[PDB]
Curated annotation (Swiss-Prot), chains A, B:
Aspartyl protease that mediates proteolytic cleavages of Gag and Gag-Pol polyproteins during or shortly after the release of the virion from the plasma membrane. Cleavages take place as an ordered, step-wise cascade to yield mature proteins. This process is called maturation. Displays maximal activity during the budding process just prior to particle release from the cell. Also cleaves Nef and Vif, probably concomitantly with viral structural proteins on maturation of virus particles. Hydrolyzes host EIF4GI and PABP1 in order to shut off the capped cellular mRNA translation. Homodimer, whose active site consists of two apposed aspartic acid residues. The active site is at D25. Residues 20-89 form the Peptidase A2 domain. It comes from Human immunodeficiency virus type 1 group M subtype B (isolate BH5). This is Protease. Residues 1-5, 49-55, 88-99 are annotated as: Dimerization of protease.
Amino acid sequence: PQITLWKRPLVTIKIGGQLKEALLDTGADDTVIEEMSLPGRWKPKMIGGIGGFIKVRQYDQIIIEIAGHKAIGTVLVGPTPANIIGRNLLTQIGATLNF
Amino acid sequence: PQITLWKRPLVTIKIGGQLKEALLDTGADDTVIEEMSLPGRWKPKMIGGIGGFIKVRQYDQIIIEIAGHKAIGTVLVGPTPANIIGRNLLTQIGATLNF
Ligand SMILES: CC(C)(C)NC(=O)[C@@H]1C[C@@H]2CCCC[C@@H]2CN1C[C@@H](O)[C@H](Cc1ccccc1)NC(=O)[C@H](CC(N)=O)NC(=O)c1ccc2ccccc2n1
Ligand SMILES: [Cl-]
Ligand SMILES: [Cl-]
Ligand code: NA
């Protein structure tokens, strides 16, 4: 698809068998999701944004569908105000910015 | 142009007579620039993101040049860790996300 920016670029994602809403975000290096359960071991990460830093759980090689496109990669879980799809997974679905 | 997402999508902007670097950011509602002087009146605002809220000054009807394309809109000025071009100005240059 071709997505304009007059409204927030919200899409449906599927993770752990569950549907959720998430933001397509060219300004984010990483993908970060609100609290949920994921399989396997996790590693620590500190991430920074506009108001300061938060601590999150890093899960590698997680299966995730984004607007009907399949990806497998790194997902961060923690106290984010919103679900965000960053450049690590935008590149797996072949997304570009055009003007 | 077509911009890929392997690296941060950084471009040159002209604002207030000054040349700066800024991030093309589909996940931001607003345009936010590091401390600088701008002409005309302003009012205070609180804006949020990943680590909480920051206090900014809101300037309306500011002209800006973004990678060679002229636009006008609201610009917020304050202690942001990075300069960001948000959706209020990306719409004006015709930017879209494609996959
Ligand atoms: C997500 C993470 C990997 C941590 N990356 C980032 O946070 C980087 C950090 C960079 C350096 C600091 C300056 C911002 C840039 C760009 N950001 C991405 C960037 O796209 C970021 C993503 C985001 C969206 C929603 C909620 C939180 C965070 N947006 C923002 O920071 C913008 C700023 C603004 N216009 O007010 N926030 C919002 O547009 C926004 C929308 C709804 C909200 C609801 C509740 C609380 C906060 C909310 N913030
Ligand atoms: Cl920890
Ligand atoms: Cl505006
Ligand atoms: Na003004």
